[PDB]
Design a protein around this ligand. Structure first.
Ligand SMILES: CC1(C)CCC(CN2CCN(c3ccc(C(=O)NS(=O)(=O)c4ccc(NCC5CCOCC5)c([N+](=O)[O-])c4)c(Oc4cnc5[nH]ccc5c4)c3)CC2)=C(c2ccc(Cl)cc2)C1
Length: 141
């Protein structure tokens, strides 16, 4: 599995779904389909949290990484599970949408990098040891 691909496809899907553009994301399949379906379902179930986050972020170029780090720490404070990983992807999608809304499209490239590195370094061992994306697909696909 390729975490950069997973992030790129997911962000492209979310942005395209809501009418936003991301130049660098213009373009195993089972993981991408499962992740985007899970995230759509999460956003429907927690739509109030989704709207609240969308309206409160108030991003700027110098604060975006801190907003990202602050939410991700809180999201995982009580431990990682697959639903919190889906929530992390959905949050990354909100950060990207809000970046364009604030006329800061270049931040989408940064956020995709931060998500990828989070998967590659912080979440990597938990994901591997709890069965990888294959287990996520068996559970929720
Ligand atoms: C600063 C903040 C921290 C403040 C708080 C919040 C918001 N909070 C974040 C944590 N949150 C969680 C966490 C874990 C779970 C969970 O059950 N965990 S679980 O048992 O592992 C699991 C259970 C089911 C599925 N799948 C169902 C399938 C149904 C058929 O279709 C395929 C999927 C999965 N799964 O991984 O797919 C995994 C969960 O409940 C669900 C319920 N339905 C779900 N559907 C998909 C995922 C999911 C999770 C919800 C609640 C909302 C913040 C916030 C704000 C905006 C954005 Cl944008 C983001 C975050 C920021």
């Amino acid at each position: 599995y390729d975490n950069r691909e997973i992030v790129m496809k997911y962000i492209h899907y979310k942005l395209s779904q809501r009418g936003y553009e991301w130049d660098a994301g213009d373009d195993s399949e089972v993981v991408h389909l499962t992740l985007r379906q899970a995230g759509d379902d999460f956003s429907r179930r927690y739509r109030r949290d989704f709207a609240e986050m969308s309206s409160q972020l108030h991003l700027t170029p110098f604060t975006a990484r801190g907003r990202f780090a602050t939410v991700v720490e809180e999201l995982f404070r009580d431990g990682v599970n697959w639903g919190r990983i889906v929530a992390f992807f959905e949050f990354g999608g909100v950060m990207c949408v809000e970046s364009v809304n604030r006329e800061m499209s270049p931040l989408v490239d940064n956020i995709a990098l931060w998500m990828t590195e989070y998967l590659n370094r912080h979440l990597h061992t938990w994901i591997q040891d709890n069965g990888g994306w294959d287990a996520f697909v068996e559970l929720y696909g």
